[model samples]
Target: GGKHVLCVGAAVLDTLFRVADMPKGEGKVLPYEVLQIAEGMASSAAYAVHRMGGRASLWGAVGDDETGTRILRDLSESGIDTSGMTVAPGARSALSTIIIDNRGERLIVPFYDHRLHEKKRACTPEDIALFDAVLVDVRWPELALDVLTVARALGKPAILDGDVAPVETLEGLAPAATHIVFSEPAATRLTGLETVKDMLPVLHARYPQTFIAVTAGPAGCWWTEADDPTVHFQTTMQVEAVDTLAAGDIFHGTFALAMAEGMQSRAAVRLSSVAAALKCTVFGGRIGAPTREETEEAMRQWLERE
Candidate 1:
């Protein structure tokens, strides 16, 4: 009904290594499986929106190197609008090497070439009118906030994905976001409460109108509001996960899209949890996120009907 999402953040070539057992310290072990996929916050979520039957655009910088070329081609092939992306010469492009264990847990190490870190050269204030909502990641704080300010001025919503960012950053950002979704620790940091229920009132007291949510792995998710201090739960999908990467990314993307598409707050959160849970069943982040039809079917079938 409205413009598709515009994600302003980072993108990189990801190398997912599946090892039978993680090496301890200096213990030597070979990388048994190597899978390369173009990934990062903005790229992954932007792809999620497009894959889920929404028009998606991205704003970020990249290198002119081979890695960047591959990533840009991948994004283009996936049908994301790359109008705001800038490819700079003499840069290696951003990349990450993730090691996953048998339990689907992982250790990630990232290498972001300096070229991709400069967003001012690419995304501008004029691009603010291009979308219904703007998805901002914690990376590149200045650029993210610049976009956030524009989104606020245009009266469009901004979804803040606080995935293990520093407390100080979230503190500065909490007031501006329309929706604030945090990882478990980030939620704890925000409320300073031991249990999630107690934390609801703490956050509600600070910023009452913002839609705040926390992602709890097996326990599902919890949320609070300005007037209501009650913690709400989003049902989780039951699936054996091979790798858990990008679950949060998918959740954020779907949640933003659902909200943009006119779904209620609670319904949108539940639907996003469903989408994320579905993502965990597959091997990697980009591989598992569902298509629009699949997400809709999941909502219809698995979500608790009122």
Candidate 2:
């Protein structure tokens, strides 16, 4: 049987601009490259799962507008199952304009019709019973909560892609997750502190019930073991990052797939890191995401360096 995974959250269009540097003052900046794609937090993760040869179904709200059409079109073209997606009747589709510098850092300004967030779906036990894992991003916190709760109760790897969000949302969803993967900024906000070296242990100790981990971009991923509360780190493979648009989503998707397949936490983090680093090396956002074969070959090469 395949590792069937459910990904829940944002599904929107992203227009990317590659600038030599982010604008310092308000003026017209020339971008060397400009491209548009249908990619968002959870959608990107779902694409990652597809690229890695997992059976993925996306559960996110999209408008019935043109962009939504493209969003659904792209997913189908990529072979991801859209059985879980919903169409927001009176809302415009979500979209974002992102500016990326040569360093791979990005500044995103997005417009999401609030009606998209108005989605309310009760995940029946049967809905969750079919998937090996449920991975949700913070964009659809309520939906994330609903699915994670059911997935957790059923002992699935209910992973949270903990990006930056309000404290109340984090507090509400963290408990529902069997594994909470935090971004550096989100961990800092939740813990009111800085530095992965300092924050990883604090998060692990506080969220002792679930597995806690942080993806520190180029610094790699940090997490504690199931039996040990001590911190462990996996240094990312160094790459010349060009566009880091959906790298975090790539990490979360790969991590969720690995968990569904029963890999250890450390190994999952390492594999996810490899998937993400490969994304950073290429341009065009989610297009940079590596397949399972690419990731394993890169991993073998990385290990040979050891």
Candidate 3:
């Protein structure tokens, strides 16, 4: 049976620009390239799961508009299950403007209609319990909390994509998750810390029984399991990046799948790192998601080189 993951959070239409650098001051700066695609934290992760040979189901909301139509179409084409997704009428779909520099770092401005909330829960505890694992993001707090609670209650792995958000948001969502992985900036925002190494102990002190991690783009990922005082670091595979978008999302999904398949934590982190690093070698958000065989081959080659 294929490992199944329930991914709950945001789905947005992205307008991306390839610029040499971000403009420091307001001026007529021209982008060298432009692209558009369906991307959001949870949706991107779902795509990664599907690409990596896992059954991925998405539970998120979008407006009944062309943008939403495109989002659904793209996801459907990628073979993701969107049966539980919501289309809110008369509301604008979430959107993002992304500027990627030549070096592959990005600056993103996202907009979502706060009024378009999924008031009704789409999946029950029983529905969520059927999945091998659950993955959620900080975008939809209520839904994330609900899904994580169900996963926790069932003793299943509950992974949270703790992307950049207010400290209060992380504090609110941390308890329900079995593993909380944050982007480096999110870790900084959550604890006013400088680095992932500094944030590990602080996060562990708060949630002593939860696996905490922080992912730094080229710097690699650091993780520490519950009751284990020793923190672990997994160096990322070095690759020339074309576009770094969706790399972190891919990492989260693959990590969840590895955990579901009973891989050890350090191995799971390494697998995810390889997957994410490979993703950076291509353009577009969903375009770069690597297949399981591709990931394993890259991992093998990387191991051989090391």
**What ranges in model 2 sit over 4 Å off?**
24-27
Per-model CA lDDT versus the true structure: 0.78, 0.88, 0.87
The C-alpha local distance difference test score for the whole of candidate 2 amounts to 0.88
Better of 1 and 3 by lDDT: 3
lDDT tens digits by residue: candidate 1, 22-75: 767876668777889887887888888877767888877778888888888888
Q: Candidate 2 lDDT, tens digit per residue, 47-113?
A: 8998888989999888888999988888778767987789889888899999988877788899988
- Residues 78-116 of candidate 3 have per-residue lDDT tens digits of 778998888887888988998887877788888889755
Which rank order by lDDT, best down to worst? 2, 3, 1
Distance from true position, residue 217, model 2, in Å? 0.9
**What number of backbone clashes does candidate 3 have, counting pairs of residues 3 or more apart or in separate chains?**
0
**Residue pairs in clash, model 1:** 52-292, 208-226
Candidate 3 ranges with C-alpha deviation above 4 Å: 19-32, 105-107
Which has the greatest lDDT? 2
Give residue 124's error in model 3 in angstroms. 1.3
Query: In candidate 1, where is summed lDDT lowest over 10 consecutive residues?
Result: 115-124
**In candidate 2, what residue range of length 10 has the lowest lDDT sum?**
220-229
TM-score each candidate: 0.90, 0.95, 0.94
